[PDB]
Design brief:
part of a larger assembly, 3 chains, A mainly beta (114), B mainly beta (207), C mainly beta (146), B: 207 residues, mainly beta, five-stranded antiparallel β-sheet, C: 146 residues, 1 helix, 35% strand
Chain lengths: 114, 207, 146
């Protein structure tokens, strides 16, 4: 969260597991697996997505899967500011792989042909 | 410390006898054959302001009752004919039993209903009723309904008191009044609440 | 049967002022100004008191008793300049050792502004209040189908 130091509020970060369509209302997401991130005493929120699959490996490029889960952010609470402080904030996101990630069956398709 | 808190105790604050009802009966003249009156009154504290208001400080309660009866009589006309001494039947009908509907009736026969026979001109009659209830305490306030989609706030059942005159009609009509004095005993209370003002109170928590 | 843990939170800045009171009334029989099962059970939406539908009177707490005495009930005070969170741990209260939940409401929770809300110019003109309820030591008997 890259807003002001004087802002306060709450956000809801929810994870929908594979095979479930994304939630559309805050109440639906509240009943799943979620965390309430409090803008005002923490500036960054972390969420670890675990490994779920019937097989030991999954294809990088696949079609018709339409699963894997989702990560959603919802307005649990409005954002309050003390004074003429700007009411427009920005948030950034970063993604990484944990220490149990792996890949195999090397495939390269780069080509500049015209 | 030479000051004690023993006069604000619950027993001291509550266990005091006060009149709750006046029940009128009479023995009519043997010439006119109108029905002999009998009295019926269901035991309830929601007619005495003081006792009720002192009970609404709390929500759950337990106590036994001590009942005393003060009987008085008088002739109701200037006649030289007189009457002999009178005996009164005072029947206590526990909670759940039928109530009398006529002066002569099987209800003044059942071995289940305990009665007192009191002869006029002697010490007042007295009895003690225990804690009679299906729950583990009375509830002055009850946030609930009997049937869900029905009465809003359960009512407590204590019994009934019926009274009549055993003597058959004299040639003189004589009218009698019995005053009932109730005294709670071994009382316990729970979960205090704010008291209400003196606005005639109300039948429920309505105002 | 079950107990509850209620956590109330208010999101406010350092330029807002006001005070809230949270009261936990056992057997909170309310009343309007005349009830049915529809009035006494508004659901998670809750209900709102009113001053001088079904809306009890705020200064009487809806049951004819003055608001000032309301502090006999379990209570807490949220003063925006000191703290903005409150927590109540409610045990199970009832005359019976266990009862039907669908018909009987054990507790009622009331939130009343003791001192109105005010703020510095151009701030947020209305702040949010959030409730979080957690049952504790639940247990049920008499399981039906479905």
């Amino acid at each position: 969260f890259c807003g002001s130091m004087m802002a306060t509020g709450k956000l809801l970060v929810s994870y929908a597991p594979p095979g479930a369509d994304p939630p559309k209302k805050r109440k639906e997401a509240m009943l799943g697996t979620h965390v309430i991130w409090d803008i005002g005493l923490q500036s960054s929120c972390t969420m670890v997505v675990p490994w779920i699959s019937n097989t030991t490996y999954r294809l990088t490029i696949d079609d018709s899967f339409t699963e894997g889960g989702y990560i959603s952010v919802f307005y649990q609470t409005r954002i309050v500011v003390p004074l003429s402080t700007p009411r427009e904030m920005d948030i950034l996101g970063f993604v990484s792989a944990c220490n149990d990630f792996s890949v195999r069956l090397l495939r390269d398709t780069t080509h500049i042909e015209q | 410390q030479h000051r004690s808190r023993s006069e604000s105790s619950i027993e001291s604050f509550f266990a005091r006898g006060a009149c709750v009802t006046i029940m009128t009966v009479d023995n009519p003249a043997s010439t006119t054959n109108k029905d002999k009156l009998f009295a019926v009154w269901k035991i309830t504290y929601k007619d005495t302001v003081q006792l009720r208001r002192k009970l609404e400080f709390f929500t759950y309660s337990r106590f036994d009752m001590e009942l005393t009866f003060v009987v008085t009589a008088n002739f109701t006309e200037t006649n030289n004919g007189h009457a002999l001494n009178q005996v009164y039947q005072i029947m206590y009908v526990p909670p759940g039993a039928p109530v009398p509907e006529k002066w002569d009736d099987y209800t003044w026969q059942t071995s289940s209903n305990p009665s007192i026979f009191y002869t006029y001109g002697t010490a007042p009659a007295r009895i003690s009723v225990p804690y009679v209830g299906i729950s583990n305490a009375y509830s002055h306030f009850y946030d609930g309904f009997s049937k869900v989609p029905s009465l809003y706030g359960s009512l407590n059942d204590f019994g009934i008191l019926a009274v009549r005159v055993v003597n058959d009609p004299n040639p003189t009509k004589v009218t009698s009044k019995i005053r009932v004095y109730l005294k709670p005993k071994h009382i316990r209370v729970w979960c205090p609440r704010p008291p209400r003002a003196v606005a005639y109170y109300g039948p429920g928590v309505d105002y | 049967r079950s107990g509850y843990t209620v956590h109330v939170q208010c999101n406010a800045s350092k330029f807002h002022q006001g005070a809230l009171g949270v009261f936990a009334v056992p057997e909170m029989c309310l009343a309007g100004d005349s009830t049915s099962y529809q009035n006494a059970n508004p659901g998670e939406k809750g209900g709102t008191f009113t001053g001088t539908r079904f809306c009890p009177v705020d200064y009487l707490l809806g049951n004819g008793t003055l608001l000032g005495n309301a502090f006999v009930f379990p209570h807490q005070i949220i003063n925006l300049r000191t703290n903005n969170c409150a927590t109540l741990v409610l045990p199970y209260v009832n005359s019976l050792s266990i009862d039907s939940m669908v018909k009987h409401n054990n507790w009622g929770i009331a939130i009343l502004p003791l001192a109105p809300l005010n703020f510095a110019s151009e701030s947020s003109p209305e702040i949010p209040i959030t409730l979080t309820i957690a049952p504790m030591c639940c247990e049920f008997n008499g399981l039906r189908n479905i």
